[model samples]
Target chain A: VHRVWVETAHTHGGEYLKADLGYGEFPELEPIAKDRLHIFSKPMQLVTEKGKENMIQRGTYNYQYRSNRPVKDGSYLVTAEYQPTFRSKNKAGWKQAGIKEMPDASYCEQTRMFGKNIVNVGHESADTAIITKPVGQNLEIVPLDNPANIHVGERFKVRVLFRGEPLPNATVTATFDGFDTSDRSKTHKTEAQAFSDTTDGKGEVDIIPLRQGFWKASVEYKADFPDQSLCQKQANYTTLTFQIG
Target chain B: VHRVWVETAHTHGGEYLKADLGYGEFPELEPIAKDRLHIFSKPMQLVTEKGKENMIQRGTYNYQYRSNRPVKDGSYLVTAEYQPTFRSKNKAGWKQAGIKEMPDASYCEQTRMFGKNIVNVGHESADTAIITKPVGQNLEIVPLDNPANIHVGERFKVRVLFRGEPLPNATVTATFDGFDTSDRSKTHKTEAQAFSDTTDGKGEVDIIPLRQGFWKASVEYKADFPDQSLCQKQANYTTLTFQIGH
Candidate 1:
């Protein structure tokens, strides 16, 4: 299973900031059909000693964004949206991607939305924005608390949503950059794996970043297409990525 | 004396790239009057396996510039101009800056032109652009050879120019980031110290980067003002910076 993710190259504030949209293993670079990707700049937040404040979106590009201003010696949230859509997953494509084929499923309609945030600690003190609010995507994984105050042994909570409504029983899997050394989507651990969990009581999943590098978590909701004779399954995926320290 | 130099915070290709425009120490930061600074992007070169190419200047900010493109997986020269001018150098200002005051000089007219280049090795192969051609600055230090092929034991050459003409016997001094760990102009090494040199037969100075780090060299041209009744002296300065490796 080629899990789609946004891998950022330039994290700090600057002119040539860029992140790639593709699917592969965690922290590893593997890309697929480029036409299915649409990236955007979502809402962000500014965090200071007093508390959190909202910052407006500036300018965005097809593959890049520019967010710079003057006179803010504190930390702020910089976010990006990574999206992918595909209408067909044929048997040959499934075999080529090394994903196990599903029974009675020759082609699956897929839609995905991904969001990423990097807390730039350039000028002064810093904290990761848990963005407790949604940036208005079809499906989103919103952080419930700041990770800058969380440690490896501790857990950071996130809530899953669909159109602003909580996704009660969504499947979420998370991983960091160095967590897996494999080349493909070979990671599907147990709930005890600090790697997999299901949202309960209306979309609250506590994910453990486990370490101090970049990490990401994905939530999936698969359903039957209206015309089952044409397509067996229609799956919509949403993911969130942030830093832990 | 406190001479202005740009100490960049971010490089490569990015949006938040910022280089401080100030004076005080090398690899160290100290600031003066803020208005005497004007930074620009002169020109840059792109070097590939085949040869060298020219890249046009894009949009520039007060403290940053945006220069990014696609599809060419090779190294390119990213350059910026740092210009500073001061009409009055009061005795108090000189004394505060720790510079030996010019004799009988209350104020000296000064004009400085600084150009910085980083050979961003963010691609397939890497090489420093030895910009043999001038980028049209009032006083410029143009590299005669690339530093990428030159190592610690080897030497890299540069030429000095004022409005496209060479200046003979120009005073050029160079030092790396970690060469001198002092706080002020403690780096005016002797000509015999491999830290200072004079241009011969019109502006040719060989500077060694010393080790694998960032380095800069400055040239000073001093002369009496056309009418000394208003100002005692007129001095123009220009500097060039590059990296040896990581």
Candidate 2:
């Protein structure tokens, strides 16, 4: 399944939000010509345990597609939407044959396919940190247990949300980054230890973090659209990223 | 035991806040000459699930010995401080009472005792409605389980607090004041069918309300102070009252 995710590197200002695309568990560094990616970043509005404050800009980062400033300490929500379309032909005829045989040729058949991916990023523990409203074929993975207080060796529960509702029996997979693994010279490939599971009736699954670092939970679903002209089928993907101590 | 609690009657404006005193499982309706009661009322500030607003006054109430205004919807915190003192005489004489009995006593042997109580109120579900800080020998009762979503005919957990800490083994009792198992024409005593329990090591206990109405959980504790001049021993009590739905 085609999907888009994020890769964050710790910077002096904060964390640099970098968008990535991939197929399965690994990110695809090579850019695809047909893929269109949009990024939206906004500080998550939060209320303290006691006091109340107006919309104050504690840091310099604002809402935009991309910014130079690093992400701030408080809660921030970053969403990336990726859409890619591709055309396929049953046989190789257009290159050697003339253009007139494209539609009427009995041996030639064409198909169009589309892909959509939504990704949310931030450290906010509240439920409002994620977009709860249904847009299109939205698929999301949110931590049902304590995401803020997550620690190594602790099993945390996560839920799958599809179109603002619990998506039961959905498959959820996780990948952890930023691990040392005893080798300082070699680069850390976290996907080697990646785990996967299927959600229960209530769209819930449990995951135990093996180490302290950033992690992502990704869920994907596919269905044929009613409008056959639009595409034969559409694959929807959602990824949520957060840190654990 | 000397403790002050509240009884709130539901009203359109909100809920009517009323105060009462009690010992053990029974209430002390008559006023005490030595008891000093102070009431403070304030609208509890809360942040919505969406995390917006600041110092928001969702409900209106404040602190005083008493008030006439009815509380509105939202969270509210009402705390009452009660301090009372008394004296007692024993078979022992002044010689055995030590050197600190020089307060010009009419008799030779006597002892003094003191007690302090603090109580808070508001909706059943809000954590901001409880007293977090300790004042004197403050005694409080908070829901050990979900205080905000308490229902009738369900056994819920409650905790007793003393000096901002759990009061283990403290005796706690409860009563449903507005029930119809008895005389319908007469006023509800609230003490009928009262339940009692001793808090565990975690200062926690449970009670199941049989019917929907006003309910109160009461706790009492007593201990002797090291200062012989202060009093021989003092009894402290605390009660929490709220409504339960069917």
Candidate 3:
């Protein structure tokens, strides 16, 4: 599945992390509509957490929120939230009045994308409890253990929660950076992910990574729209991006 | 020469630029004594410029400061400064009182390193006159034009200054991010850079980049010490790291 996540599984925590976008190909980056992107982050030992501005980038503009604060050697929580009801292939416009609407008749979806990325600065943990904290989104994948230390041979567990409760029977799939090696020119493909597992009664699944590299786990839960006349379905897509290496 | 510099040349201006280090090998990182590392920066249109802490990283700790202030779409000036009267191979230490001494007799140097890196956000030409501005180091290399647009076939020029004036006889050299490819384990080398030139009467030289890639330009000037008791020679190493592509 196409989503946004931090690129490096292991980076100098004392440096910086630029949370960016991803598509069909592993590790390749594609731009996104910043106007619809919402991000919430928690850095261990940080003096500032809420409403602080993070340095923004990509030519696309949006209501942004960071800093260059070199993170302390500890665990960090990053969530990239994007919700777009519709979009099309075109150029330009404004938001309120003069903003021209660019619509593409071929593309349509009421999708909510939630991506959770963990940054283990001093080698994954000082195991702070922040990585698995509930995002409070309509649909979110909550990790139980430290993501930074999860390896290829070990099992990674996560809960698929829908509407704040267990999401049993949810089909969760995962892929990694550069997992799609054949074609990178496109942002997405119609194939199943490299690995997958169904959520148990407790709304959790164990996806033992088949390979060692940066990974992104996801779950797409469909629900009826409050008004069927307005739209067809609400595709709540949640993703957890991390690295197994 | 061993010095500190930013790794990437052409980065997304709209994204964040994490100013970092350089070693004997391009792109490889080697930690430094942050206690002796000093940095001064100039980012065009940045809300805050002086004494603002840049969020720092690397497990090694020292006197620090910073935040995640994402840079705006504009050119940025990053200068990594390092000073040391002496050093050795060893381990362990503290700062004020409890710190232990780590030393080795085989290694030593009295050197000052000045590294200048340019970030050309939105393709280099809101030039804004800051990319070429002198960093005001004891021995500095001042760029005369915007560095983000200099290419392999084009001529890149700089002025070498000593004690704030033109140092006509200084030897200047340039290297790219991966210029040292034969060896990756060490942090320094004794060979000459990929390109070289000598300053003229005006204290300037034009280094024609041999390849099209991320580049670093330097000038190493040696001077005598006021008291030989402390050291033998003063090696003032200055470098400017930048990319030629827009």
Candidate 4:
């Protein structure tokens, strides 16, 4: 039923941090004294998905933000804590309910209970960029015609995406776990190009096999360039069937 | 290196926040300074496990507690968001060079940061004892036998633990996913006994089959007492695999 927030507005060389909690009308909560820095607290409550509720002791928070350099020329640090309950022992089988507030905007008086953030002023800093940017997406590689019949020196393809949108720039590396018994190069060929390719905007890669039997193609994105948080290994392998005719 | 801490003794409350980045010592950083808050940052470092080095952003946490109430009665809320780096397109593979600090402190620091009575405290009027003690551990249940099997009309046992320690007094509720593959009556007349007993401090349960097939036992605990916080379901369902013979 309660939460916390820190708000800071800056002027050149004049940095500050603002702390507020009462964006919405807190029904049972009232400020003890409107003096200088008013600290208000209440007992903690534990609610369950199943109709059950309990209350803990008082709760409080201490906050501070200094005005110096904007934590950095374009970087900053945001820190806070949220402890939803006090310690106690109860009957087993009870479920704890989630806190009812979001803890973000001071908007509409909805009064979010808990959240975290950092800010950037001039250019878009990673600390404060819009989250809607297509960061990463799930990928899957499946053979079209007779995927299971893929053999050494044959060709196969894969699909890549960013937030489901087609993306380019993925470095594809295929590790030939088992090579074809027919290719004499299997005795000596180990070129990095034997298994690497780059993706286009369509996020697709049509790779012709140099030699293969059982293999795994690992597609990975490099770090910090944006959209690298999503990386996965595909496990579906197309087993090749050759007609000895 | 231009880090600074303001005020020897700080108090919670007030609308404004302050940070000191030591403009006096490192005037070089002063130009980058905007105001009071210092944009504290650090690069993502590589953590080595075995011989492989994985890029991990250094994480830092802020410390502060001992709220406005009696040490025994105060409680508070701390929240945060988790931000990650974008993936790479080229084969170089993406690595996060930096990750923001996480604000929540590890358990050992809670006492020093929040003060002693931080867990249990008195209410506003100073007359009522609102909170009493530290919350108990979060518990989980695991089936030792066929972890994925359970049947009605069949009797089985399960053990519970809190961080490897046997958890006693935790509540457990057993329910069937399929209807009447076996018996559902609390008390049924059969040669097979239903339940053995509650968990000893060892965190265990013994039950007999009342029916057959797959059933799930949802074990949970809400230590908030009669007036504590919400009912917290600790352990979820541990799958019960029961078969006729196999």
Best by TM-score: 3
Residue A183 displacement in candidate 4 (angstroms) = 69
Candidate 3 lDDT by residue in tens digits, B14-82: 565555555434455565445434432322122123432444542242322222565656665765566
Model 4: per-residue lDDT, tens digit, B57-166? 21131322122221222221111111111221212222232253233322110000000111111222122122111122233444444312335333345566554456
Per-residue CA lDDT of candidate 1, range A1-245, in tens? Answer: 45545544434443333344434444555434465344322333333344444444333433332333332333344443344344676555322111233455457574554544534444333444434556665677777776666786466788887657787756576656654332233453211112444576657766654457777777767655546566555566666676667
Q: What's model 4's overall lDDT? A: 0.28
RMSD (Cα, Å) for all candidates, in order, is 27.9, 29.8, 25.7, 32.9
Top DockQ prediction, candidate number:
4
Runs of candidate 2 exceeding 4 Å displacement: A1-245, B1-3, B9-72, B89-137, B145-148, B178-193
Residue B181, candidate 1: Cα error in Å is 1.8
Candidate 4: deviation at residue B128, Å? 51
User: What are the per-residue Cα lDDT tens digits for candidate 2 across A29-74?
Assistant: 3333333322211222222222222222232222112323444443
Instruction: Sort candidate 3 into its docking category.
Output: incorrect
Candidate 3 wrong stretches, greater than 4 Å: A1-245, B8-14, B33-68, B87-109, B124-128, B184-192, B226-232
Q: Give the runs in model 1 whose Cα sits over 4 Å from its true position.
A: A1-245, B7-23, B29-65, B68-86, B89-108, B123-130, B184-194, B224-232
Candidate 2 chain A, which ten residues in sequence have the lowest lDDT sum? A108-117
